[model samples]
Target: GPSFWLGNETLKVPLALFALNRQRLCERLRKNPAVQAGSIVVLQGGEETQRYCTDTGVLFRQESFFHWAFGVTEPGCYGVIDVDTGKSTLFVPRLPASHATWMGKIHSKEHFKEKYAVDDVQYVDEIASVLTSQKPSVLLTLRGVNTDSGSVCREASFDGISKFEVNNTILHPEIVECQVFKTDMELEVLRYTNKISSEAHREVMKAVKVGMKEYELESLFEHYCYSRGGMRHSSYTCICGSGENSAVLHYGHAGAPNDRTIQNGDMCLFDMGGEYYCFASDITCSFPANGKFTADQKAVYEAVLRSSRAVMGAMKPGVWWPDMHRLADRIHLEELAHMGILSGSVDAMVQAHLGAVFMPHGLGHFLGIDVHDVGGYPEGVERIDEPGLRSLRTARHLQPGMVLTVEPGIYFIDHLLDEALADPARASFLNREVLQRFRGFGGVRIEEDVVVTDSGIELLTCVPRTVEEIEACMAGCDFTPF
Candidate 1:
């Protein structure tokens, strides 16, 4: 379902530009004191192995740190930033002299140095000696939780005492914190990525057929993304789940493969993101396979759309992301109650955080270089305390240049529903009869990328969000592939 050729074509310009912007970003980081003078930041080349495969460990560039500094797209390379001079050096693995004859000509150090615009380049083996020579005061590394998705790993956990560390002070948080906002060039790449991803989604909507397998839709999407030159630059794994599989938030790979047949009454949920030039564009859209929503389907779809809009409308400078999620929850709770899926007063349900039972995941997350990106919650800021609010990616007030997603969904998950129904205090608030009516009806989610502006917010995705627009697209509306 994933198309590599499309990604490669789409990635060329963005990748080239990304390399240029990373050079400037390093200059900005050098001015920060936390980095320290003569500091050596060891960035591990991303291990080139498939997340879905255990044995196929081909070479692929590590994403986060590699994209941040050298902007080189190859694997098995490391970047070192000289704090004192703000100069960068790239270290690449040297191919054995004999192996070169078998594996083809190995690019000389000067070739890579010129390509990545680095001041110096050397073999990977030289890294240890170089670090030993500098003995820099500190080693800066990325250290932060992916709050939006709840994934956390210690920063430089394997670097400090490893061969890369020697005699340097390990400094976490310095490099990651600097990645919070996007530079002008970075934003341009993201803009292109969103444009292409939106177009690909439109293609899938038009190609949906009642008897087709879900993977067919995935194939159509992957084709369009690649045709538009996005094959090698996908933002993250493509999530092509349908029907009940849509309820799983991160539905990708084995557990929720896009293999289900698109039956007449089933709803198709496509959650896909494209990476253009190393920047990510995260978007999700749900529609019926038959090109028309049933009464119950329309209700759920509208609810998610309303919640997504409410969150987008609430985004502005000085407004915290957690507050925006709470607002979205309020909207979802009110809509769910109106649809008779929940009993009792809306105010009571809101106060009790009833929406958490239905929409357990955070409203959205930061979107940029990495899908979840970096610099969500900076150090020293207190996290929000509300039920669903605590899962927010950022609690800090929105700034003018911040970029994020406004995704809100309403799911009828059996486990989540059973858990709520079993709770005495909370059980009384749910209308079991109405909830059961849509139990296996699957779910609805609408995700769109947006940029915080001084006045309000700018919706990056122009894909149709309304029920009518989706129906029209399904009915073969003349929308071009992005």
Candidate 2:
């Protein structure tokens, strides 16, 4: 979301980014059966409103699906795209001309057409006449479940186009499928956002101290992103957990507001990213708060890092996403066994689903316009209902233009540990005495974004990841610039 009303946009989103998206959607629509019959995609933009019962409202943020196809940032706008012709029309609000005093320059319809790079621009009321002349067989409206948030996308409902048969079925799924793959321009913004995000993480790494409250680190993340990248919003809430707080997977929320005081021995697991021109980035950096890792911390750090690296090593087009999940699960357990945290057969532990006890969350998720991008589990793709596998965000085959967060983590969560110990079948793998001593150790998660290439993978995060590099950065000895 843009921070404020800057005459120009906060961070200029390349017109080509949305242009490429529109072209891709049009290409996909041309082949769709519903669109083949003659149709136009109609989607409603997000509206401005308040929290509960007041005139107060949150800052304006464009809806993802509409933003992808139309690139209009203002609220109350509507978009129309012809499937066969690939021509687009944006219906902007016909603001009262008198409101211009406070609104600054009220843009005209021609101005909108030029700004959005659309073929035509008109008032919201004009859609009916335009569609009537085109004689479209159906009106395709946006609506679908966003897998990550489990929320249904809002569809456009207005009086103008009720004459034609409304087809909501194909538009949602097909548009999401198009969004799954990144175009050249889309990749550029993603890379730009990630670079700024890496700089933010590295800046926070330098600013951390033993006595600073966790919220301070969160502040630093937001500050660096805004100062350097012109991003006012984090892709999501910042997760800055230190000491035992790090063990909780989704820590640093309202209930646990990153308020813990950092201690010397505590390790900090900070996961945050910046939103650049509406594109998103997600990166996680785990390091000792005191600028040096102890033996135990080093063990956890190395294992998670190894697993992350291994998963990236195996990723490429045509590979199954579940295989990557299993690889991360297998590698994490193997590393734990090597560290004496768990004992007995390593392969048997993975086969018996022991990995879920230590690391319960999904390895990672898609990164794009939204933090958890669309099309994780497409229409036909379904989640495998198993311990480690069920938490997976996507199960589709990897393909070029797909970007993902490859995060691998291990935690010493108390309840999960207790449950596993109580079950004899799983207890054989535990070294209770050693594991109990490290119960408060929290966890370690090494995360970075990677792009699936035809040959292999390309790492997007540019932060210091190795043990030595992290130490150098904390010690102010890092000579290389971020």
Candidate 3:
């Protein structure tokens, strides 16, 4: 049974996605010589933890590996896959019938078995006997380091499983790589997530006016997305940067709470997205706080917009991701030079790696179940630690069915600019006096989600990207997608 229904079978997710994913993971397992018969892939679901030892439980998010395999919702569950036959089983906590009073209806083993399309479903307590029947020779556990966050991927463990050899490395990347290329249903949800987010940005843009606090925009954007359907949590903390706040890459934290009052000339950059059933969307839009775009604001906005567009156009299967990042830097440098913020040869500026100062973070990262998705740069794929290239999340080649965000930005970060101007080596290409006029001018970042196709890319993001479209929408002038 590869079908699941939520609360009265009203809400549903397509099982074809999980089925295809299991098929892919099994194929990867079959390719490895270390994988032997009687081997099973086992992953544990996330447990409901409290708010730092408090009674209040945090919302449960499934372990990515388990989610990739079974797509269950309950906490403290376990999933097992027979590497030899590709058959799947789930171990769910057996709740009492009286538990339905507070936690909703109690489900039977058959209910879960049919709902998740698993070959079998049983009480987690019965897992011991179940393992005995399989006579498992090896248990495929999960363990890995997430390069971007430097956090270790959790491994599946239990006291009794020591009878067999436990190996996580063999199937770790295999499972992650399977998630890289999304299935058709996965693509649909991603596109839907982006569409809702794009529309939310539109509403938030129209709602912005002078005197409104920065957090108001974030509140509006998050609420609007949830009202659309069942999007619960945001992909990441919302970034509602206005004026100087726009320069902060990971803004909107409590310490830097989005509390600034947006001014008329402020360049507002809201990098936010919603997670629908765990798949996330990371789309950002920058525009003027007021209805009109000032010359400086328009210049920077168009620069980022064009660079993002150009990169998306050049993207397709077989294209190296790092090369695309370098391409974006070259375009930004060329545009900055045209705007008089930069000087000298485009190649020289790019080679000097000065573009990283303007766009400090990586061009973008993989987008999927998590914001910075897995399978970014696997084994044998080393991250090039140069100035502009150091912060990259993924340098692997673009693959068909992979989803990515194309975000190119230009920031007049005061301190960064000040430091650059001080060093003679760094200030050689600067038009210092001219740049001084744009301090506190904030930044402009235009981001869009795109899916790589065989030939090029399919732009999944449908929102106002151009100066004219943004201005029209802000003015309450009918949003015409020009």
Candidate 4:
């Protein structure tokens, strides 16, 4: 079992304050005509619970949207934003009297209503009648295929409306578009989320040593977030992979546990994020397990770092996120060429869009309530059409309130390299002999969260970016615990 610690007492204040501010913002949205008058905006709380082990299940947390709009931490709770009056009503499950003996004291409706700053709070059973009085013109619900599972949860029953099936297409698009930009409170919450996770990353670099299992590294990360930062939840599952496992993107399953003993020369890439007050911070930092990079490792690591830095330097107001990704693609492509993995005219390869061969995923995504926050491709914006550009998480121009991640990586995936070699048009760009020397070198990625500001970008992550800074800190010369 892993040890856990709560964050500073001062940190919890901001999280509570941010939730209160979110409730106020939803009130303003009720009066907007675009939201449609007499509409009930419902955000469903997540129901699934992930079991981490046999005796203990991972703590269940409510969905971000639901938490933001209602500010309720409890499960089986839903929020309704009244479009007519800007007032909100929260529906919370009323635990049975007998369950109180097992689950402990259950707060009354009044207790939650005041705590969340909502106009009213009622038992879950009363939601049907409350909807009847509102006589909403339509019920607004989030409708789309789930990004992870690719399955669609129908919107018909989402708003407690069955036979009166409202058109989901128009209602859903409006809500998603509105969710893209972060409010002042959301920005503040993210600032804290990034800060705490950055410290946790520092802890990981110090805790990681030779002969340690990858899961132990993850435990150290969680310990910092929970014990030091007081963030009890993670934005997503931890991606703690070392050596060969690092090649598999999003690898942290039971079958492929991080049980491999880390060796001196092996590279460790930990992709993890923390949830603070329902807001999320998604960041990744790859480094040498022994706190020193070998020549080959340094080459690959520097390429990824350069790609990440290039994206951050260019991120600013009026720059579209998709275009930023294209910029990153070009940057990585050039770095790969310099590393002898690719050889050719940089401009020509970029024009051919060959960068997708080495780096397939988007550079990064919008970060907020969810790890991959909503509101990327808002309506009315032209979508990018290039091979790799189309996969960008957001296409909207960066704005002051926007919060996002700038992560660019280089992976030596054999299958992708093989496909490129087989194609005459794309194969010409690669240097086979140079690439073959680093076939199983795995991957390197560096990520940081930044807030687009009026003049420039604010790097929310306070972790060291340069190799010297990371090495110095990892060597215990600049250690600081919050």
Cα error of candidate 1 at position 97, Å: 3.9
lDDT of each: 0.72, 0.84, 0.83, 0.73
Cα RMSDs, all models: 4.4, 2.7, 2.1, 4.4
Tens digits of lDDT, candidate 1, 1-482: 11112334453343344444455555666766545566665566664566575776554635665676656777767777765666677888888889877778878999887676677898877776777777776666554465455665444334333644333223335555556676666676667778888888988888888888777876777677666754554676677667787777777777667777778888777888766546678989899889999999998899888878777777788887777787888888888888998868878887777888788877887787788867777667767676666666767778877788888888888987898788886789888788878878777888898888888987788687788889998888852211
Return the number of clashes found in candidate 4.
5
lDDT at position 437, candidate 2: 74
Worst 10 residues of 1 by lDDT: 1-10
Q: Could you tell me the TM-score of candidate 4? A: 0.88
For candidate 2, lDDT tens digit of each residue in 258-306? Answer: 9999999998999999886678999989999999999988988999888
Q: What is the overall TM-score of model 2 with all chains considered together?
A: 0.95
Model 3 CA lDDT for position 441: 85
TM-score for each predicted model, relative to the true structure: 0.86, 0.95, 0.96, 0.88
Q: Which residue segments of model 3 deviate by more than 4 Å?
A: 1-12, 477-482
Spell out the clash pairs found in candidate 2: none
